[PDB]
Symmetry: C2
Subunit: 494 residues, 2 copies
């Protein structure tokens, strides 16, 4: 019934907000639609896998908030296997390599690839993390899809194929689906192309021992009966002194303030009184989430390591169901496994098949790419298609089609009377990630603390000390990387 | 409580569906979120205006279903004023003209304008009305915005400016917001560029005497207490023998079948058990409605007619708040008025102003365009910003961003167990319009009649006899219009003669 703050959503962001408020001495209630917490994180446990992350999993350097929260809850990380060689598979052939990006030998192709990554970062330096609509060329870049930008930038099919895979992998959407401004912002606010794409020293460096679902689970443990499961929120009424929040099972909650910690578009599932302001009313119809199936194939041994392959595969082309894999073996070296993502249109196309049919296609692909018959003998399989989830809408996160970010972007975290907005989509650093979920939940919690006169305005946004366990190495470039001409640049010189 | 069919939504589509089912002898209930029926149609009545349509208003030749339904309800149409000259206002100057499209004198610009409209229709002929995703180049066209297509097609700024206005006016969205495949489908399924853009012999030919809101109102009168107002649906449960539908005010309805007659994205406001299939789950998050403010400025007399202007203005340029107007004077010649649309980004930009501020900007624009000081002396003003509507989401209709129609289009009207889908967005002829609302509502109703074994399969889709009151003249082209080269076409001819 009555409390200080109702938090709508028991994902990492909602849980992080509720914990901060609880620790500050306020009475909080979390209303969660599902019969579990964690949202876009979900750790499955069974005897065959021990544990496996079927949603969000990876953490890395510069993601200090999620690392701090997890450590406080008694969790530890381990390093994703990147000891041996990575593989770039292109035109039916595997090319092993070391370093974050697959190397290029043809001189013209080299210039084109170098210019592509460089230009993504160059453009990003003009985009404010907390206000991408304030970029000098915001409208020009927002009125273009990533497909148009890539068609302009990439003088080789080689670069365009890799750039396309990069987009698909980052935001689980097609290049023609997404705004160029939004995508460039997205990469920039994760620290740039090297940081986002790297395993060692990047976003995919580590996973949590025992799974990421433990973050939301352990906060639920701390909050006790304050978390209400199977309470989908249906109605928010702000016409009176206290805010009224109603659930599908007909419970009524009364609070001074509300935190909305759900994907922006899932705000549509709530009927508002009074109606939302015009801009938010339309915004929440314009912001879909991507499409992905996360698939984990289990083997008797991590056989790829014997061939000096780490398990990372970057796989070009339409025919391949999975464009990117990582070794998912446990740190102890057992429960050998390969994790792959079926991305964007392929998630939609391949969903028509059976689980067994998808397993077969993945095994035959992996056998090809790894050059190993052992890939054809899986011992177990787990998968999750996030497109089917009513209370997620997709994964990993919300994307912005052309024209939307400039017109509606500023309303994302703008309070509506006594409703404040959390959720990873509202973060300014690693938005889209578990890190962004923590940032946004704590920031939204502090907005309410300020509204209550409990903290000053300059404490709403708070810096985070660097993790001592996962220190960040700086991102470096070489002289030649910085100064070598693009393809059209070289032609000008000629 | 218990009935044969629950219809969710009391707009024209839901009301047409409910009426058909009722007439067939079934027990129907209509659950409507608002304190009124009509949805994206709304006729305001007061002493200053008598009546005025603030939402959907125009009907025309080839829209035979809405015309038949309205006639059966005792309604009549009248012709929108197009006796005098139209105005094209470009680069701060007005150019009066006659005919549906502004004439072009520059031979190069002429070729470019002629090729633009022609090519829109050429491309449209490759797109099946009932399955646009089956077009031979569906993926190529769907992966492009209308902005990209226009940049490719238009060799003059003049053509590109007019083409941009055309898109904004048709679908209340920016050219960079919308799929080229979807937009080309949208125009084709209204009968093409001439039919959609025309007043005389097109979509803007007529309005209903007394307002379009009367269609939904008079059906409510026929259905009596079967229409439940202020019953927003929150929950649909199909796990049991009969379908359970719950409302926000905690009422429960039980039915054999359900018709969803709401904008596709507004399906998000309903919690489903079991969850929707994956494709529909995601589709309903990918399909926004456009942005528009409909504004009506009232004057003592229709003074523009005295200067041989009909009241139609096509107004190019960023500075102009309104890009298109029509005479909204009553057929009796009184309550003189100009209707204008504030479109797409301008609906968002200008919403920041007060009502009085918007009135002032419109009057000063109209004074300039009509060359008339009388435009600065309004007697009344009415407006409606559809962007603010929780139970509409926007107007006129739903648009598809790049990539969506080919991936998700086929699920739009695919039944989900015992839920069938009406609403104008699911129509195949004048989708987006009141006509499409009628087509989709009656089609969805007949899908259920077939499911009940009451009619054969071949009766689900039904042709409509042409109106005797609003006959359709065919769309014609001239020999030169058909065969004159494009700009690049002419350049090829110059290339070959020089080679
Ligand atoms: C799904 C997914 C996947 C598959 C994967 C991934 C992911 C995901 N990611 C993302 C994450 O997870 C996120 O971000 C988070 O989680 C979010 O959080 P938040 O914000 O909190 O949200 P959520 O979860 O959703 O929650 C919400 C809640 O609420 C609820 N609801 C709803 N509605 C409602 C409710 N309640 C009441 N009422 C109502 N009405 C729900 O239910 C929930 O619970 C991620 N992240 C990270 O960090 N990491 C990771 O890993 C991840 N993942 C992914 C990744 C990938 N990566 C890749 C590889 C290579 C590369 C890449 C990228 C880039 C570059 C390279
Ligand atoms: C808004 C608007 C405006 C401003 C204008 C216009 C329009 C609109 N349009 C469109 C129409 O209106 C439509 O289509 C119709 O109406 C639709 O119907 P339906 O489908 O039925 O839908 P609605 O209405 O929306 O209804 C629904 C219902 O439901 C309900 N709900 C929700 N949710 C819910 C519910 N319930 C229960 N529960 C729940 N959850 C709601 O409330 C409702 O009621 C149009 N159309 C026609 O036909 N006409 C006209 O006029 C119109 N408009 C416009 C036009 C324009 N035009 C222009 C001029 C020149 C040109 C153009 C275009 C093109 C070219 C040229």
């Amino acid at each position: 019934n009555k409390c200080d703050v109702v938090v709508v959503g028991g994902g990492i962001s909602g849980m992080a907000a509720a914990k901060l408020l609880h620790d500050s001495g306020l009475n909080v209630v979390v209303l969660e639609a599902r019969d579990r917490v964690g949202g876009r994180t979900y750790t499955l446990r069974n005897q065959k896998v021990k544990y496996v992350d079927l949603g969000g999993s990876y953490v890395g350097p510069t993601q200090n908030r999620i690392l701090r929260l997890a450590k406080e809850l008694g969790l530890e990380t381990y390093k994703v296997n990147e000891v041996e060689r990575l593989i770039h598979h292109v035109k039916g052939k595997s090319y092993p390599f070391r370093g974050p990006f697959p190397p290029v030998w043809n001189p013209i192709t080299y210039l084109d690839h170098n210019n592509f990554w460089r230009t993504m970062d160059d453009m990003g330096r003009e985009i404010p993390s907390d206000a991408p609509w304030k970029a000098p060329l915001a409208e020009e870049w927002d009125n273009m899809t990533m497909k148009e930008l890539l068609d302009k930038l990439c003088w080789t099919e080689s670069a365009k194929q890799l750039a396309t895979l990069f987009v698909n992998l980052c935001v689980t959407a097609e290049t023609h689906e997404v705004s160029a401004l939004w995508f460039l912002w997205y990469v920039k606010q994760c620290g740039g192309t090297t940081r986002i794409f790297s395993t060692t020293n990047g976003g995919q460096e580590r996973k949590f021992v025992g799974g990421s679902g433990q973050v939301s689970e352990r906060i639920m443990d701390l909050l006790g009966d304050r978390v209400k499961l199977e309470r989908p929120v249906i109605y928010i009424d702000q016409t009176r002194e206290n805010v009224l929040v109603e659930t599908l099972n007909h419970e009524m909650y009364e609070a001074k303030y509300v935190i909305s910690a759900i994907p922006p578009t899932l705000g549509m599932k709530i009927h508002f009184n009074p109606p939302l302001p015009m801009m938010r009313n339309q915004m929440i119809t314009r912001v879909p989430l991507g499409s992905v199936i996360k698939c984990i194939v289990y083997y008797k041994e991590p056989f790829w390591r014997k061939k000096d392959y780490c398990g990372t595969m970057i796989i070009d082309g339409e025919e391949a169901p999975v464009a990117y894999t990582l070794d998912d073996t446990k740190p102890e070296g057992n429960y050998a496994a390969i994790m792959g993502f079926i991305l964007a249109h392929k998630a939609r196309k391949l969903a028509r098949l059976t689980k067994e049919e998808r397993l077969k296609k993945l095994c035959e692909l992996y056998a090809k790419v790894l050059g190993s018959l052992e890939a054809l003998e899986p011992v177990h399989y787990e998968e999750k298609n996030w497109c089917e989830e009513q209370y997620s809408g997709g994964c990993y996160t919300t994307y912005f089609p052309p024209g939307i970010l400039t017109q509606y972007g500023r309303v994302l975290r703008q309070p509506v009377d006594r409703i404040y907005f959390a959720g990873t989509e509202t973060a300014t650093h690693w938005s889209g990630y578990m890190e962004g979920a923590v940032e946004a939940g704590e920031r939204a919690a502090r907005e309410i603390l300020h509204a209550m006169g409990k903290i000053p305005e300059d404490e709403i946004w708070q810096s985070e000390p660097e993790s001592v366990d996962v220190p960040a190495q700086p991102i470096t470039t070489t002289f030649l990387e910085r100064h070598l001409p693009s393809v059209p640049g070289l032609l000008r010189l000629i």
